[PDB]
Design a binder for this molecule. Structure first.
Ligand code: HEM
Length: 183
Protein backbone atom coordinates (compact mmCIF):
# COMPACT_ATOMS: atom_id res chain seq x y z
CA UNK A 1 0.00 0.00 0.00
CA UNK A 2 1.00 3.64 -0.34
CA UNK A 3 3.31 4.93 2.37
CA UNK A 4 0.54 7.10 3.76
CA UNK A 5 -1.08 4.04 5.30
CA UNK A 6 2.16 2.98 6.94
CA UNK A 7 2.76 6.50 8.27
CA UNK A 8 -0.71 6.44 9.82
CA UNK A 9 0.15 3.15 11.50
CA UNK A 10 3.39 4.56 12.88
CA UNK A 11 1.62 7.73 13.99
CA UNK A 12 -1.15 5.88 15.80
CA UNK A 13 1.21 3.55 17.64
CA UNK A 14 3.56 6.40 18.50
CA UNK A 15 0.75 8.62 19.74
CA UNK A 16 -0.99 5.89 21.73
CA UNK A 17 1.99 3.89 23.01
CA UNK A 18 5.09 6.03 22.49
CA UNK A 19 8.24 5.88 20.37
CA UNK A 20 9.87 2.97 22.15
CA UNK A 21 6.81 0.83 21.51
CA UNK A 22 6.82 1.90 17.83
CA UNK A 23 10.51 1.05 17.47
CA UNK A 24 10.00 -2.43 18.93
CA UNK A 25 7.10 -3.00 16.55
CA UNK A 26 9.04 -1.74 13.53
CA UNK A 27 11.99 -3.95 14.48
CA UNK A 28 9.72 -6.96 15.02
CA UNK A 29 8.09 -6.33 11.61
CA UNK A 30 11.49 -6.52 9.91
CA UNK A 31 11.57 -2.84 9.01
CA UNK A 32 14.44 -1.51 11.15
CA UNK A 33 16.37 -0.25 8.10
CA UNK A 34 13.52 1.99 6.91
CA UNK A 35 14.27 5.47 8.25
CA UNK A 36 10.82 6.82 7.40
CA UNK A 37 7.84 5.96 5.20
CA UNK A 38 7.37 8.09 2.10
CA UNK A 39 3.68 9.03 1.96
CA UNK A 40 3.22 9.16 -1.80
CA UNK A 41 5.39 6.11 -2.52
CA UNK A 42 4.02 2.59 -3.12
CA UNK A 43 5.17 -0.15 -0.72
CA UNK A 44 4.67 -3.90 -0.78
CA UNK A 45 1.46 -4.78 1.07
CA UNK A 46 3.77 -7.05 3.09
CA UNK A 47 5.04 -3.99 4.93
CA UNK A 48 1.55 -3.26 6.24
CA UNK A 49 0.65 -6.85 7.13
CA UNK A 50 3.96 -7.22 8.98
CA UNK A 51 3.26 -4.09 11.02
CA UNK A 52 -0.20 -5.40 11.92
CA UNK A 53 1.28 -8.73 13.00
CA UNK A 54 4.12 -7.13 14.94
CA UNK A 55 1.67 -4.73 16.60
CA UNK A 56 -0.57 -7.62 17.62
CA UNK A 57 2.38 -9.45 19.21
CA UNK A 58 4.06 -6.50 20.94
CA UNK A 59 0.83 -4.97 22.24
CA UNK A 60 -0.71 -8.34 23.06
CA UNK A 61 -3.95 -7.57 21.21
CA UNK A 62 -5.65 -9.71 18.60
CA UNK A 63 -4.76 -8.28 15.17
CA UNK A 64 -8.45 -7.91 14.39
CA UNK A 65 -8.99 -5.72 17.43
CA UNK A 66 -5.97 -3.63 16.49
CA UNK A 67 -7.14 -3.16 12.90
CA UNK A 68 -10.48 -1.89 14.17
CA UNK A 69 -8.70 0.83 16.15
CA UNK A 70 -6.55 1.61 13.14
CA UNK A 71 -9.57 1.94 10.89
CA UNK A 72 -11.21 4.35 13.33
CA UNK A 73 -7.91 6.27 13.50
CA UNK A 74 -7.65 6.62 9.69
CA UNK A 75 -10.78 8.76 9.65
CA UNK A 76 -9.10 11.32 11.90
CA UNK A 77 -5.63 10.94 10.36
CA UNK A 78 -6.75 11.64 6.80
CA UNK A 79 -8.79 14.64 7.93
CA UNK A 80 -5.74 16.10 9.68
CA UNK A 81 -2.89 15.24 7.31
CA UNK A 82 -3.98 16.77 4.00
CA UNK A 83 -7.33 15.19 3.10
CA UNK A 84 -9.76 17.21 5.21
CA UNK A 85 -11.44 19.02 2.33
CA UNK A 86 -11.60 15.82 0.30
CA UNK A 87 -13.36 14.09 3.23
CA UNK A 88 -15.75 16.99 3.66
CA UNK A 89 -16.67 16.87 -0.02
CA UNK A 90 -17.81 13.25 0.30
CA UNK A 91 -20.73 14.36 2.44
CA UNK A 92 -22.27 15.08 5.81
CA UNK A 93 -24.09 11.86 6.71
CA UNK A 94 -22.98 8.24 6.91
CA UNK A 95 -25.14 6.89 4.10
CA UNK A 96 -24.22 9.71 1.70
CA UNK A 97 -20.53 9.31 2.56
CA UNK A 98 -20.62 5.58 1.88
CA UNK A 99 -22.41 6.22 -1.43
CA UNK A 100 -19.59 8.65 -2.31
CA UNK A 101 -16.71 6.45 -1.20
CA UNK A 102 -15.89 4.93 -4.59
CA UNK A 103 -15.87 8.44 -6.02
CA UNK A 104 -13.69 9.68 -3.15
CA UNK A 105 -11.17 6.95 -3.95
CA UNK A 106 -11.40 7.78 -7.66
CA UNK A 107 -10.33 11.28 -6.61
CA UNK A 108 -7.53 9.89 -4.46
CA UNK A 109 -6.55 7.71 -7.42
CA UNK A 110 -5.95 10.76 -9.59
CA UNK A 111 -3.06 11.62 -7.24
CA UNK A 112 -2.01 8.06 -6.30
CA UNK A 113 -1.64 6.51 -9.78
CA UNK A 114 -1.03 2.96 -8.56
CA UNK A 115 -3.95 3.00 -6.14
CA UNK A 116 -5.81 -0.26 -5.56
CA UNK A 117 -8.81 1.15 -3.75
CA UNK A 118 -11.54 -0.86 -2.06
CA UNK A 119 -14.97 -0.89 -3.73
CA UNK A 120 -18.05 -0.15 -1.59
CA UNK A 121 -21.66 -0.63 -2.66
CA UNK A 122 -24.67 0.34 -0.56
CA UNK A 123 -28.01 -1.39 -0.67
CA UNK A 124 -30.34 0.69 1.45
CA UNK A 125 -32.88 -1.28 3.44
CA UNK A 126 -34.45 1.81 4.99
CA UNK A 127 -33.61 5.46 5.64
CA UNK A 128 -31.71 4.22 8.70
CA UNK A 129 -30.08 0.99 7.56
CA UNK A 130 -28.17 -0.57 4.74
CA UNK A 131 -26.34 -3.62 3.53
CA UNK A 132 -22.76 -2.66 2.70
CA UNK A 133 -20.77 -4.58 0.12
CA UNK A 134 -17.00 -4.31 0.54
CA UNK A 135 -14.90 -5.68 -2.31
CA UNK A 136 -11.11 -5.68 -2.27
CA UNK A 137 -8.06 -7.13 -4.01
CA UNK A 138 -6.70 -7.67 -0.49
CA UNK A 139 -7.33 -10.15 2.32
CA UNK A 140 -7.98 -9.51 5.97
CA UNK A 141 -9.08 -5.90 6.06
CA UNK A 142 -12.75 -6.31 7.04
CA UNK A 143 -11.90 -5.40 10.65
CA UNK A 144 -10.37 -2.15 9.44
CA UNK A 145 -13.66 -1.49 7.66
CA UNK A 146 -15.52 -2.03 10.93
CA UNK A 147 -13.31 0.58 12.59
CA UNK A 148 -13.65 3.00 9.68
CA UNK A 149 -17.43 2.82 10.01
CA UNK A 150 -17.17 3.70 13.70
CA UNK A 151 -14.84 6.59 12.85
CA UNK A 152 -17.43 7.83 10.37
CA UNK A 153 -20.13 7.43 13.03
CA UNK A 154 -18.11 9.72 15.28
CA UNK A 155 -17.42 12.14 12.42
CA UNK A 156 -21.13 12.51 11.73
CA UNK A 157 -22.32 12.23 15.36
CA UNK A 158 -24.30 9.16 14.38
CA UNK A 159 -24.75 5.93 16.34
CA UNK A 160 -23.71 3.05 14.13
CA UNK A 161 -24.49 -0.62 14.71
CA UNK A 162 -22.49 -2.87 12.41
CA UNK A 163 -22.51 -6.63 11.99
CA UNK A 164 -20.59 -8.60 9.37
CA UNK A 165 -22.82 -11.05 7.49
CA UNK A 166 -20.53 -12.45 4.79
CA UNK A 167 -16.81 -13.19 4.86
CA UNK A 168 -14.29 -12.96 1.99
CA UNK A 169 -12.00 -15.34 3.81
CA UNK A 170 -14.58 -18.05 4.45
CA UNK A 171 -14.69 -18.33 0.67
CA UNK A 172 -17.84 -16.31 0.18
CA UNK A 173 -17.77 -13.78 -2.65
CA UNK A 174 -16.94 -10.69 -0.58
CA UNK A 175 -17.47 -9.13 2.84
CA UNK A 176 -20.96 -7.84 3.54
CA UNK A 177 -22.09 -5.80 6.56
CA UNK A 178 -25.50 -4.97 7.94
CA UNK A 179 -25.56 -1.44 9.33
CA UNK A 180 -28.12 0.52 11.35
CA UNK A 181 -27.60 4.23 12.06
CA UNK A 182 -29.39 6.99 13.98
CA UNK A 183 -28.63 10.61 14.95
C1 HEM B 1 -9.56 11.44 2.40
C2 HEM B 1 -9.75 10.23 2.93
C3 HEM B 1 -9.03 8.98 2.39
C4 HEM B 1 -7.91 8.85 1.68
C5 HEM B 1 -6.93 9.96 1.22
C6 HEM B 1 -7.71 7.44 1.42
C7 HEM B 1 -6.67 6.88 0.73
C8 HEM B 1 -6.40 5.54 0.72
C9 HEM B 1 -5.16 4.93 0.31
C10 HEM B 1 -3.90 5.68 -0.18
C11 HEM B 1 -5.28 3.60 0.43
C12 HEM B 1 -4.19 2.54 0.11
C13 HEM B 1 -4.59 1.70 -1.11
C14 HEM B 1 -3.36 1.36 -1.94
O1 HEM B 1 -2.24 1.76 -1.54
O2 HEM B 1 -3.50 0.71 -3.01
C15 HEM B 1 -6.62 3.32 0.93
C16 HEM B 1 -7.11 2.05 1.21
C17 HEM B 1 -8.30 1.76 1.86
N1 HEM B 1 -9.31 2.66 2.13
FE1 HEM B 1 -9.22 4.73 1.70
N2 HEM B 1 -8.76 6.74 1.99
C18 HEM B 1 -9.59 7.66 2.58
C19 HEM B 1 -10.75 7.42 3.26
C20 HEM B 1 -11.31 6.19 3.47
C21 HEM B 1 -12.50 5.95 4.24
C22 HEM B 1 -13.36 7.01 4.98
C23 HEM B 1 -12.76 4.66 4.20
C24 HEM B 1 -13.98 4.06 4.92
C25 HEM B 1 -14.46 2.88 4.55
C26 HEM B 1 -11.71 4.01 3.42
C27 HEM B 1 -11.58 2.67 3.14
C28 HEM B 1 -10.41 2.06 2.76
C29 HEM B 1 -10.12 0.65 2.93
C30 HEM B 1 -11.00 -0.42 3.58
C31 HEM B 1 -8.73 0.45 2.34
C32 HEM B 1 -7.97 -0.91 2.32
C33 HEM B 1 -7.54 -1.32 0.92
C34 HEM B 1 -8.35 -2.48 0.39
O3 HEM B 1 -9.43 -2.80 0.93
O4 HEM B 1 -7.90 -3.09 -0.62
N3 HEM B 1 -10.84 4.99 2.97
N4 HEM B 1 -7.29 4.53 1.10
Amino acid sequence: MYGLVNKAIQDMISKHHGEDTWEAIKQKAGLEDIDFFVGMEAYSDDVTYHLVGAASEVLGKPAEEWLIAFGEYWVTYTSEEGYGELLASAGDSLPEFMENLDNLHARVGLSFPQLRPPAFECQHTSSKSMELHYQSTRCGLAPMVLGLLHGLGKRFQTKVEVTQTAFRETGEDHDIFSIKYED
